[PDB]
Amino acid sequence: TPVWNDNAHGVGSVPMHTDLELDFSLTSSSKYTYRRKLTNPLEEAQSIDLHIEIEEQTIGVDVHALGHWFDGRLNLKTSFHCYGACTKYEYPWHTAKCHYERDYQYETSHGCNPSDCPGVGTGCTACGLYLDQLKPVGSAYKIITIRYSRRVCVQFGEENLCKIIDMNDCFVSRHVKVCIIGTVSKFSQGDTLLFFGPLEGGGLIFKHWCTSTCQFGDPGDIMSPRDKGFLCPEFPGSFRKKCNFATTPICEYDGNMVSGYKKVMATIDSFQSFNTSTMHFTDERIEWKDPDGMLRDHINILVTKDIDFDNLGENPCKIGLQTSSIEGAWGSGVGFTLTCLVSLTECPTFLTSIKACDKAICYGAESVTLTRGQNTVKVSGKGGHSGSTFRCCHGEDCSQIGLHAAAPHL
Amino acid sequence: TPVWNDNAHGVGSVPMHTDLELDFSLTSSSKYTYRRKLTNPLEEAQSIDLHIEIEEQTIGVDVHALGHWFDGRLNLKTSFHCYGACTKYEYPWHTAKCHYERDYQYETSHGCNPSDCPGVGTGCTACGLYLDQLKPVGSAYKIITIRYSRRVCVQFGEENLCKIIDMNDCFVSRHVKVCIIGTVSKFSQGDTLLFFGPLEGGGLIFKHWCTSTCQFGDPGDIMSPRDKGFLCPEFPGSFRKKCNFATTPICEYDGNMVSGYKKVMATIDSFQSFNTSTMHFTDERIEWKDPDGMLRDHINILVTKDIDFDNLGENPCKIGLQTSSIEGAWGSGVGFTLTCLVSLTECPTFLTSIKACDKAICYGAESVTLTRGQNTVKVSGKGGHSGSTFRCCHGEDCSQIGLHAAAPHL
Amino acid sequence: TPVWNDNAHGVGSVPMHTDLELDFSLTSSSKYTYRRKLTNPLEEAQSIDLHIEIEEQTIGVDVHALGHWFDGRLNLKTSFHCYGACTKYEYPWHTAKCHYERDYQYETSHGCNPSDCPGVGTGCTACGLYLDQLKPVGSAYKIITIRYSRRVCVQFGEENLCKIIDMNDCFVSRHVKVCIIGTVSKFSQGDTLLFFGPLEGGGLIFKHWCTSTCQFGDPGDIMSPRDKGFLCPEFPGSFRKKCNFATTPICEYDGNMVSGYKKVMATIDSFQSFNTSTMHFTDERIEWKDPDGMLRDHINILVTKDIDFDNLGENPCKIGLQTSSIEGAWGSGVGFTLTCLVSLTECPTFLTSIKACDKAICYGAESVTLTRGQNTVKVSGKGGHSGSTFRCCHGEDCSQIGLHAAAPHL
Ligand SMILES: *[C@@H]1O[C@H](CO[C@H]2O[C@@H](C)[C@@H](O)[C@@H](O)[C@@H]2O)[C@@H](O[C@@H]2O[C@H](CO)[C@@H](O)[C@H](O)[C@H]2NC(C)=O)[C@H](O)[C@H]1NC(C)=O
Ligand SMILES: *[C@@H]1O[C@H](CO[C@H]2O[C@@H](C)[C@@H](O)[C@@H](O)[C@@H]2O)[C@@H](O[C@@H]2O[C@H](CO)[C@@H](O)[C@H](O)[C@H]2NC(C)=O)[C@H](O)[C@H]1NC(C)=O
Numbered sequence A, B, C: 001t002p003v004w005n006d007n008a009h010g011v012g013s014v015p016m017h018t019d020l021e022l023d024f025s026l027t028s029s030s031k032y033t034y035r036r037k038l039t040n041p042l043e044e045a046q047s048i049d050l051h052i053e054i055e056e057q058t059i060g061v062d063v064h065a066l067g068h069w070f071d072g073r074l075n076l077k078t079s080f081h082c083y084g085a086c087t088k089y090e091y092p093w094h095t096a097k098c099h100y101e102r103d104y105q106y107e108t109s110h111g112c113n114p115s116d117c118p119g120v121g122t123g124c125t126a127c128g129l130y131l132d133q134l135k136p137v138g139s140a141y142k143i144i145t146i147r148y149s150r151r152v153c154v155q156f157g158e159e160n161l162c163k164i165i166d167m168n169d170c171f172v173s174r175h176v177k178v179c180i181i182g183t184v185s186k187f188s189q190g191d192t193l194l195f196f197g198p199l200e201g202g203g204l205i206f207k208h209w210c211t212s213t214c215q216f217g218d219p220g221d222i223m224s225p226r227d228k229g230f231l232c233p234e235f236p237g238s239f240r241k242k243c244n245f246a247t248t249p250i251c252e253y254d255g256n257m258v259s260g261y262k263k264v265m266a267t268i269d270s271f272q273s274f275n276t277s278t279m280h281f282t283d284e285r286i287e288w289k290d291p292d293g294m295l296r297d298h299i300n301i302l303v304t305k306d307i308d309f310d311n312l313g314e315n316p317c318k319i320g321l322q323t324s325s326i327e328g329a330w331g332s333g334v335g336f337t338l339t340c341l342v343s344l345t346e347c348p349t350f351l352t353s354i355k356a357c358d359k360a361i362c363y364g365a366e367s368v369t370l371t372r373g374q375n376t377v378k379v380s381g382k383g384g385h386s387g388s389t390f391r392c393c394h395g396e397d398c399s400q401i402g403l404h405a406a407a408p409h410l
């Protein structure tokens, strides 16, 4: 007969037994303070201090750091030999991290040879494209998850409690409820954020950063994921061997010659900037306060001075947690799955959520009806980094250890 | 003087004449149950059973099924003839559903002919690209419309009513109001959902699935919309005829050789997965429950035990409906328009909404001020399938027949 | 000790001292009217007229007008001369606004010359691509900012006040609060809106309109930003010179030949339409009412008849404003920054917002704690046009002049 459930975060109240309601639209980038002495209508001389502090909205973005985007110049060179396979000779572009070679092997002919080459169907004209004058222009981050929150502190008499409240969640206590409701549409999963400097200050949003095909000229075309090593772009144009009598062959390439950075800069007003304040970069995560004062969220504060609220998630159920296994990846839009062993006592069943968390950041949650005794719960999550130890959590309680997920893009 | 309006779904209340309020943030993937005996303060011995059941959030997506995405291999063949027009000969790739031929016609020459061909300016070198080793890898669906809802059942005494409540709509009865407020940003119109298996389980979101230009290597490059017949990708590279004395010409192609499926798999962590539970595929529609427990919505429940709420949409107006005509398409982001003949009586005017619906799914709505007598109302909608009969509807009332829209992509 | 803050738009109330609450979900495209006489419970004969009018939701989009998109035909011509540099001769495509020339200079040869040309390594074969049969097919607009609002008028007794209330903001007066809460996901920043006619009526949303690389065949490939002058697309295919003995060379081009307009039309159902009503185009801004009756927002109205609400933003602080400087651009996703000189009196500090506005449209806001005396406040904004004079504003108060930002895409 009982069907305990703690997935409802909020309260039951009787409107005539409720003393105060604050309801307002608050600038997202603003804090809010409320202080009041709750006095007894005047049948008493007993007063309760109420002190509420709401902090500015914070955004937390789980990301994959993509490394640096580069500007560069596309260069073309020709190397001709009258005799010998193309691989017999070393070419100047061989040291270039990003090069692309097209060979014309065993194709010498009378009207396309230098004066000293009498070869026909011999040797090699090698054409080499390579990037040079490389310079990093910014750091790029792929958005995996976006969350907004406000830190909320409530003092009611001598009770004082602070909590980070996610947007569209509620702060719940015996005498005070604080609910935050809102929506923001600035950032999307899969967007790529580009920071051109120590871009505290701000950055750019790219909605079409190249992924499965990067061609030279694309946003994101030339990337270095870590200090050394490039992900090189494709060069989709064609080579031609230009021929003349008594003349060395000359390679031509008819594709785009202008880097993605230059093409983006040339139409920079087509792209959306954002600003940041009090940035915090950690591995695969960025947190900041967006100073855009045009954005607002909705705050509702309900206070009952005498009778307690009915906490809609109240229950006698008791949970023990440990991690069992993990699969999947950090830094990945596909994500990981954490398997948890969860013990339920003091209730035949309990509808609740089990979360994958590390250091008070949560990366995933599974709603589940647990049965008395042991339960196996799989939690899907996204985000984290190589050093993350994802723990199985229930409310503020977590297991004693956590597990690492695998690296993405292997 | 009267200006009846039923577009407001909700209630007028007097806070001192209201007995109970539940206000909370609920895990989207969780149900919620509230049961209570409403007793008379103690001036009576009369109690009313209140029983509220809120079901897990469901997503309903109107889609266009795009068929299967394929992996495959790009092959190149050459066919040379010393004499004759290129069309005089049948080539091996002619049976390939996806092939592309480039001809060098009447271009034979001394330094590019096999030993037995003395032709000059004759015959044909035919170059043929074709896809083979084709294998379907997943089913793709273009998102047309996204809607979220929760089924809400309220028993108040012997009154019992269940309704599917859309997110950002309200359940309204004489004694109980249930409002659901929320926002989700996981899916967008125009996204393409890819299911790799019986992907109950989950799938991938693609934000850049090819549409007006599909090149080989793109996400979505090789599609079969129905069982037989391909939408073939473009091959944007160039052919070359490689020549040698006393040698048959050899075709070369310098474009990308790697399928879109392989390119996407090679950077799969760049893409966003989603999970599903209790999937229901119907023609051009998918419904499921998203098990992502990180998502929440806001629930407000208001109860008055004695005096009825003031139903803000209450009115004496009476409506008769029939379909008149339709234009436009199902399975289309452009959509259809249903024309309805709507008769108003018992009111000089009535501000309301007329909807296009089939089997309790609604695909479009028009807010309108009707005048006494006959009215012509055009309703824009999107979604449905070839078997849909779109009816003109008002509230829960619909016309006696419905109409079919036309097929998309003709 | 005081910490005045006017960034909270709303009220403090005591639920037992509140007389009326209206709470409902309203069709976005519908107006709403409430009229009532608030009578004194019956201890009096004094009645207060309450009259609330809520207008249909309006969308306001700050845009950059991109000019007209064109359909056209891609044509190819050859021009051969036996002798002379390619630049020595004028070619037919030279007058074409969008043309692309590939030259084969000093490459004549025996098996590729007309009968009257004995040249070897001389002259020129010039290949010219050009667009012709150009026709504008629609007007395109890049979305910079999206905002929704409703005009709200409240009469309470002889007090009458009308205000445009942004979605997720509140109307605040002594006796009536009106809060609007909602979310819409139809349009996104960076989307491109295409109107094919006087498209009052509607248009199409493009999520991938070309920007930093436009190739022929892309959505947005051929644009004319203003009356005269094209932004021409790239032609990424290859030229070939087809050769025969005693024959003039013939240029070939192997790239896509089909315009972006034709490719988009051929799969038009892949794209999302929207409808409009009562459109208003101004420079770099479009406003309309979306007639999509499937969309709803949430309205809460709270009334206290006797005791005033506690206005949570009430304060004694006084502000003087003037513009100081500006940098950045109108019509730009990167935006501008307006620097304001702001004088605070009657308070040691004041937490508030300073806005950049022109003619009652606001383009940006900065939340700031001002100190008594002079303050310098930088406000980031987006939108506007060449004729905008951005003023520094606080609430409904603005400075005496405003400043122009610079043009984008210089
Ligand atoms: C939630 O989804 C994950 C994701 O796995 C799926 O990814 C989709 C995008 C699609 O490609 C699909 O074919 C694929 O299965 C599920 O986890 C996976 O489960 C399979 C089957 O056991 C394993 O082989 C995978 O290694 C595993 N991956 C991860 C990262 O865990 C998961 O089962 C599903 N359901 C739940 C409850 O989480
Ligand atoms: C709502 O919009 C539809 C859509 O029609 C428009 O589609 C735009 C994307 C754009 O291309 C525009 O040029 C086009 O008109 C309107 O319906 C269309 O109306 C025209 C004019 O009568 C007809 O020729 C079309 O067949 C018709 N199409 C459909 C699907 O009905 C519609 O009029 C408009 N208004 C309302 C109230 O629905």
Ligand SMILES: *[C@@H]1O[C@H](CO[C@H]2O[C@@H](C)[C@@H](O)[C@@H](O)[C@@H]2O)[C@@H](O[C@@H]2O[C@H](CO)[C@@H](O)[C@H](O)[C@H]2NC(C)=O)[C@H](O)[C@H]1NC(C)=O
Pocket (backbone or CB within 6 Å): A196, A197, A199, A201, A202, A203, A204, A273, A274, A275, A276, C327, C328, C329, C334, C335, C336, C337, C378, C379, C380
């Ligand atoms: C808010 O952001 C603007 C934007 O400027 C930045 O744009 C980013 C996309 C990125 O490219 C970054 O490197 C760049 O600085 C800031 O304004 C700019 O500030 C610099 C430094 O003084 C000036 O050189 C620019 O001209 C100026 N541009 C504009 C349009 O004002 C701004 O400082 C930042 N902070 C605030 C409080 O607005």
Ligand code: NA
Pocket (backbone or CB within 6 Å): A236, A237, A238, B236, B237, B238, C236, C237, C238
């Ligand atoms: Na080419």
